[model samples]
Target chain A: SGIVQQQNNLLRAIEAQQHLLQLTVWGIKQLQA
Target chain B: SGIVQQQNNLLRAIEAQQHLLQLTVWGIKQLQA
Candidate 1:
């Protein structure tokens, strides 16, 4: 129960970080171009 | 049950991405140095 909730919370955080990474990569590409 | 399993799978993927990002930063630092 609580363990599952904790896992879900961590999963959400990871997803957010992945989005940030994608944005960072996009920014780098624009700079390189 | 199944949802929990899916969450775990996604978490593993994010962990892998995080590791890749760390390595990328390290590589960039080495290049700069």
Candidate 2:
């Protein structure tokens, strides 16, 4: 329950979306699963 | 590609995560399918 934890969540989120974009390269509104 | 499109994607990300946290509230690392 701290600011660091929020950063952690956002960090993980950024990375997952990174890979998601890679997988969906040339992406639109996409991020399935 | 314009900055607006980037904002659109990020906007969607933030909202999806908002609902995600709500669903998994009292939560942890989660965002399945």
Candidate 3:
């Protein structure tokens, strides 16, 4: 819901980050591809 | 589907962001700022 990670642009805004909850041990890895 | 960035899906996933045609595409119309 907030910010997770960002790229190189300052204008880049983070909406949300999907948490996979399975293969993720550090960062949220739930983004469906 | 692509992404609009206007949805309130917090627990979901952010697929992508859809920039307005004025800021992304060319030859459409002038943006009223």
Candidate 4:
């Protein structure tokens, strides 16, 4: 099912690595289960 | 029965923090009324 909903979290990380000053809020990723 | 809830949201704001790049909020994860 395409709507199953599966995402790539690493992509964000990669983007973050690509830009340092761009992402300087000290974000916090979370997944509550 | 209401059980098993899940939420996955990434807090990686870019560009003055005025806008966010990724933010997915999922509601109705559990049905308990």
Candidate 5:
């Protein structure tokens, strides 16, 4: 239904945060040194 | 009403991602320095 639009918006938000976490953690080990 | 529960559960997911991003960046800064 139309609610799919709203859910997609929320999903978009989660995706953004996931990216941020990955970029930082991706370098976590190297950055530690 | 059903959609409400579904969206609520996704909200928790988004929050989890938010925390992970926050923690990641927090440690990343210190680790980098």
Candidate 6:
């Protein structure tokens, strides 16, 4: 059960990473725009 | 089922946002250092 919970957290962190990547790209584009 | 998943995703995104904010602050400090 604890291992599953850790897996769940890892999945969440990956999702968060993708979200942040998109935001970072947008910020870079705005800076150069 | 889906709603819980969405909530989890949002929480993850919030974590990502906080991480990004810290990085932004660090970058600014580096620039002025």
- Among these predictions, the greatest TM-score belongs to 5
Q: State the lDDT of candidate 5 residue by residue for A1-33, as single tens digits.
A: 778887788878977776776687678756655
For candidate 4, the TM-score of chain A alone versus the native chain A is 0.34
TM-score of chain A of 2: 0.62
lDDT per residue as tens, model 5, B1-33 = 996997889888787868867776787776665
Ten residues in sequence with the least summed lDDT for candidate 5 chain A: A24-33
How many residue pairs clash (N, CA or C atoms closer than 3 angstroms) in each of the candidate models, in the order given? 0, 0, 3, 0, 0, 0
Q: Which candidate is the best by DockQ?
A: 5
Worst 10 residues of 6 chain A by lDDT: A24-33
RMSD of each: 3.3, 12.3, 18.1, 16.8, 2.2, 9.5
Clashing pairs in 3: A19-A30, A20-A29, A20-A30
Question: Distance from true position, residue A15, model 1, in Å?
Answer: 0.6
lDDT of 3 by residue, B1-33 (tens): 133243334222233333332233232222211
Error of 5 at B8 (Å): 1.0
Q: What would the per-residue lDDT of candidate 2 be over residues A1-33, giving only the tens digit for each residue?
A: 474565576677777766654543423223232
Clashing pairs in 6: none
What tens digits encode model 1's per-residue C-alpha lDDT throughout B1-33?
A: 798678678867877997869866765565553
lDDT of 1 by residue, A1-33 (tens): 798787778878887888888787665545553
Report DockQ per prediction, comma-separated: 0.43, 0.06, 0.02, 0.05, 0.71, 0.08
- What is the clash tally of candidate 6? 0
Question: Stretches of candidate 5 above 4 Å error?
Answer: none
- Local distance difference test, per candidate? 0.74, 0.54, 0.27, 0.32, 0.77, 0.68
Q: How much of the true contact map at the interface does candidate 6 reproduce, as a fraction? A: 0.00
Least accurate stretch of 10 residues (summed lDDT) in model 1 chain B?
B24-33
Clashing pairs in 1: none
Candidate 4 at A6: error in angstroms? Answer: 7.5
